[PDB]
Amino acid sequence: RDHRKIGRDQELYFFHELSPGSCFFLPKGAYIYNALIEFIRSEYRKRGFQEVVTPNIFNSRLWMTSGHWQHYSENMFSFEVEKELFALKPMNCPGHCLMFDHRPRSWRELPLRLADFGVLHRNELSGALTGLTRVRRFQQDDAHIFCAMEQIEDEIKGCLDFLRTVYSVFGFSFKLNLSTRPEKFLGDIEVWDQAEKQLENSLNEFGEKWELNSGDGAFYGPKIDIQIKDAIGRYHQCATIQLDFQLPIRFNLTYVSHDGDDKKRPVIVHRAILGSVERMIAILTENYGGKWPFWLSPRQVMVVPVGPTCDEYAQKVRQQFHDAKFMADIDLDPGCTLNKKIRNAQLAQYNFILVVGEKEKISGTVNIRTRDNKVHGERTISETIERLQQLKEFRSKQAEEE
Amino acid sequence: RDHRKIGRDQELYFFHELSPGSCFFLPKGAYIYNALIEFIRSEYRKRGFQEVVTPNIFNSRLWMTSGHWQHYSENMFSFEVEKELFALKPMNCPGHCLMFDHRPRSWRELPLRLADFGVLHRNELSGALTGLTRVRRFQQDDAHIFCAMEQIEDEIKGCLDFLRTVYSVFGFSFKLNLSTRPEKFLGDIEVWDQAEKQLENSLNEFGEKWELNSGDGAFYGPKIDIQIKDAIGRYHQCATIQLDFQLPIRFNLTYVSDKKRPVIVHRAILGSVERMIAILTENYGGKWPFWLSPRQVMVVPVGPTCDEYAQKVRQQFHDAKFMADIDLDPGCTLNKKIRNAQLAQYNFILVVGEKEKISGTVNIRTRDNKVHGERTISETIERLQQLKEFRSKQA
Numbered sequence: 118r119d120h121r122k123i124g125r126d127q128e129l130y131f132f133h134e135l136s137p138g139s140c141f142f143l144p145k146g147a148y149i150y151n152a153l154i155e156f157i158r159s160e161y162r163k164r165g166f167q168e169v170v171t172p173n174i175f176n177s178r179l180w181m182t183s184g185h186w187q188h189y190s191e192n193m194f195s196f197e198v199e200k201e202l203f204a205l206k207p208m209n210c211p212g213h214c215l216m217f218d219h220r221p222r223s224w225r226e227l228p229l230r231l232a233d234f235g236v237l238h239r240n241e242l243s244g245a246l247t248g249l250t251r252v253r254r255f256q257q258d259d260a261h262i263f264c265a266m267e268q269i270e271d272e273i274k275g276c277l278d279f280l281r282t283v284y285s286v287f288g289f290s291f292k293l294n295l296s297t298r299p300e301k302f303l304g305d306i307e308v309w310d311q312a313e314k315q316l317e318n319s320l321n322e323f324g325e326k327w328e329l330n331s332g333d334g335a336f337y338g339p340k341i342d343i344q345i346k347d348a349i350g351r352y353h354q355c356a357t358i359q360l361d362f363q364l365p366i367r368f369n370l371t372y373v374s375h376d377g378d379d380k381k382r383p384v385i386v387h388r389a390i391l392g393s394v395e396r397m398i399a400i401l402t403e404n405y406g407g408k409w410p411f412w413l414s415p416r417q418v419m420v421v422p423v424g425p426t427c428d429e430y431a432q433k434v435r436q437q438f439h440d441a442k443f444m445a446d447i448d449l450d451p452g453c454t455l456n457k458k459i460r461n462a463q464l465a466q467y468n469f470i471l472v473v474g475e476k477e478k479i480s481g482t483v484n485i486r487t488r489d490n491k492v493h494g495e496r497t498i499s500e501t502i503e504r505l506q507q508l509k510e511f512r513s514k515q516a517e518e519e
Numbered sequence: 520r521d522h523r524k525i526g527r528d529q530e531l532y533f534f535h536e537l538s539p540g541s542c543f544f545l546p547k548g549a550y551i552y553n554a555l556i557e558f559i560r561s562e563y564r565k566r567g568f569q570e571v572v573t574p575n576i577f578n579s580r581l582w583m584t585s586g587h588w589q590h591y592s593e594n595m596f597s598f599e600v601e602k603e604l605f606a607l608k609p610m611n612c613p614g615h616c617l618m619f620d621h622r623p624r625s626w627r628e629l630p631l632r633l634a635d636f637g638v639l640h641r642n643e644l645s646g647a648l649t650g651l652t653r654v655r656r657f658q659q660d661d662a663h664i665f666c667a668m669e670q671i672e673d674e675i676k677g678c679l680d681f682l683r684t685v686y687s688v689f690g691f692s693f694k695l696n697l698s699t700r701p702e703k704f705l706g707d708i709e710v711w712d713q714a715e716k717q718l719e720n721s722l723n724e725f726g727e728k729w730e731l732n733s734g735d736g737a738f739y740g741p742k743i744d745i746q747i748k749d750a751i752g753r754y755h756q757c758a759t760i761q762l763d764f765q766l767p768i769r770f771n772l773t774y775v776s777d778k779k780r781p782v783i784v785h786r787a788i789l790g791s792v793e794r795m796i797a798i799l800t801e802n803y804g805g806k807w808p809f810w811l812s813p814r815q816v817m818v819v820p821v822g823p824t825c826d827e828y829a830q831k832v833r834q835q836f837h838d839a840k841f842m843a844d845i846d847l848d849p850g851c852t853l854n855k856k857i858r859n860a861q862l863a864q865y866n867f868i869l870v871v872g873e874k875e876k877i878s879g880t881v882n883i884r885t886r887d888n889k890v891h892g893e894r895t896i897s898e899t900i901e902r903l904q905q906l907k908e909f910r911s912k913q914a
């Protein structure tokens with residue numbers, strides 16, 4: 118259905134006229150935002166990606182150097198500072214190039230994979246802006262791979278595999294596209310043809326069917342564009358793999374090669390899997406219809422006292438799950454039946470409802486019910502925490518509590 | 520001794536003329552950056568603080584409503600978009616007011632504490648910019664507490680406790696100042712007096728010597744300001760607890776008790792992650808405590824026959840999950856690799872020879888060159904987890 122509506126109703130996020138094309142993520146929405154980042158970071162840690170932090174604001178001269186100013190000026194927020202033109206970054210690459218270039222580099226560091234969740238700004242038109250789908254502010258799960266010519270093949274394979282494992286945690290399939298030199302391109306047509314050839318070859322050595330997106334490459338290189346299929350039937354433009362021979366020439370990037378070859382230029386692969394956190398929250402909100410899987414759920418645990426004499430104990434249980442990092446709420450409202458409250462928490466999409474009466478208070482236990490109304494019965498607080506930690510850590514689908 | 524130099528030498532961060540007043544954090548500096556945010560996060564979870572994500576650019580009308588356009592205009596970066604005026608946020612507070620105002624509020628959800636690590640920008644003069652001390656872009660460990668009048672006393676107590684517990688982890692003492700209304704403020708003098716009286720009171724309920732600091736308050740409220748004293752004995756301004764009666768009026772904020780005004784407490788403890796990073800880089804002279812060090816373990820084989828075993832050991836510490844490196848370089852002696860790792864500031868060097876490979880152990884040398892003997896991998900892992908989890912200093 119509609120992410121804007123669900124995000125509003127579930128108290129995840131909202132939009133305000135004083136900041137069009139940006140989003141206000143309420144506590145429950147920020148939890149989803151951060152869990153998506155943690156998910157990506159945890160993959161980075163097994164794949165040799167290293168997170169960095171960069172500026173948001175740069176002198177126009179940087180954008181001139183990178184050719185962003187020439188090709189991409191329509192889309193940037195510029196202002197002046199002590200009589201010099203500055204602009205909010207729309208992409209992280211040029212910053213990353215300064216980082217590669219900061220000190221001399223050795224072949225031994227390659228591939229160098231720099232990741233960045235920094236906030237980007239693109240000046241889309243007022244009337245084109247919509248929800249989390251077309252925006253002015255976003256954070257990508259961005260990274261730039263700086264590598265040698267001989268590493269290109271393996272790194273592209275690496276990107277496709279990473280992308281497959283990521284979307285398989287959501288349960289998503291995907292389709293592949295090859296995007297060709299646009300008009301408004303940078304550098305040499307013959308260099309671009311090498312770049313297109315290599316992407317083509319990488320596409321054919323990977324399993325899958327692919328189509329041509331004629332003329333849709335970035336100004337700096339051709340790309341593999343990946344559309345994801347959600348559980349409903351919709352395709353979304355999320356991921357890219359972009360082969361860039363042009364920026365290294367622009368920034369005069371070099372590394373020291375095997376001794377004694379001369380210095381060479383690094384190759385740059387731009388990539389993003391989620392695309393932007395914002396776009397991906399949109400997609401997921403609609404995909405699950407608010408029925409979040411446990412690790413993504415900002416409603417993990419509802420604690421329900423049987424009656425008001427078990428209130429304080431319910432508060433204790435709720436605090437314990439809270440302190441163990443779960444999104445845990447409590448329903449003390451005396452006006453409704455136990456069964457009504459269980460049903461409400463279930464309609465509000467809580468994964469686990471923990472019922473607490475006298476007998477549970479006395480023994481430090483909980484009576485477990487799931488979202489889909491499965492009864493698992495009595496377990497201690499600690500064992501419940503332990504088992505729920507596994508389900509979260511492994512990012513599964515929680516009809517598996519046994 | 521200077522964070523800029525240490526940062527350069529340790530490959531933590533550097534600065535560039537193309538973005539004066541903003542920092543480039545290399546992977547090892549970015550590690551430190553995030554470990555600090557993580558530390559604060561884990562305290563938030565224990566103390567009923569709820570993190571949010573907000574926009575960075577807002578239509579100028581919001582800054583007019585908040586009182587920022589009249590009082591902070593010059594300190595802000597502004598630009599036009601479709602014939603309208605926008606500006607990058609210098610503070611999170613107005614966005615939080617919008618969030619609080621998004622739907623009617625019940626006294627039962629108060630105190631409501633909104634935490635935000637968003638990027639702030641303020642326009643400092645170029646000639647006053649220095650490393651991580653005076654900057655244009657920064658992330659504060661900011662939060663705004665929305666509470667009832669009769670709740671102020673406990674919350675400010677809580678803010679004091681939060682403060683002590685954090686600074687105690689670093690090992691810092693601190694002193695307290697009261698910042699009085701400045702010139703060019705908003706609201707009634709009378710209400711201000713009322714806000715100053717509550718800060719005065721709580722300031723000596725918390726039985727600690729405190730100083731007056733005339734006219735240094737924010738335009739929206741009086742401040743408890745806090746300087747910390749580091750290990751070298753230098754004082755730094757970091758933490759602030761600000762009592763705000765004005766923004767609730769300005770934003771027409773009410774809650775259902777009938778319909779009263781919330782009180783806002785602005786608060787930060789680290790100040791900015793940037794500033795605290797400068798302070799910590801200098802405080803230690805580059806010698807990171809284990810929980811903050813991005814160079815926690817260096818694995819060193821004794822010769823090439825132990826390369827594969829050293830690899831396997833490093834991978835186990837990496838997986839466990841430490842910042843674990845390895846030095847396979849065949850043209851440096853064992854003693855040179857150890858010396859190098861120690862000068863690079865690794866907390867522990869794990870020496871791995873033929874004995875160690877056979878036994879599934881490690882031989883450990885500390886940063887300051889003390890032997891800790893042969894140890895099993897899993898006991899060394901447990902130890903280092905303790906050091907990390909409890910954020911241990913030099914004991």
Ligand SMILES: C[C@@H](O)[C@H](N)C(=O)NS(=O)(=O)c1cccc(-c2ccc3n[nH]cc3c2)c1
Nearest residue numbers: 208342343344354355356357387388389392
């Ligand atoms: C990935 C970054 O490092 C790169 N510097 C960039 O900003 N690229 S991008 O803005 O053009 C970008 C980012 C994310 C997704 C896409 C994109 C664009 C079009 C697509 N069709 N199918 C999948 C698609 C993906 C493009």
Ligand SMILES: C[C@@H](O)[C@H](N)C(=O)NS(=O)(=O)c1cccc(-c2ccc3n[nH]cc3c2)c1
Nearest residue numbers: 610612744745746756757758759785786790
């Ligand atoms: C908490 C937010 O709502 C507030 N808008 C803010 O940004 N505060 S602030 O910019 O004034 C600020 C932030 C961090 C530190 C200080 C500060 C300022 C002066 C000080 N003297 N001694 C300790 C001090 C601390 C001020």
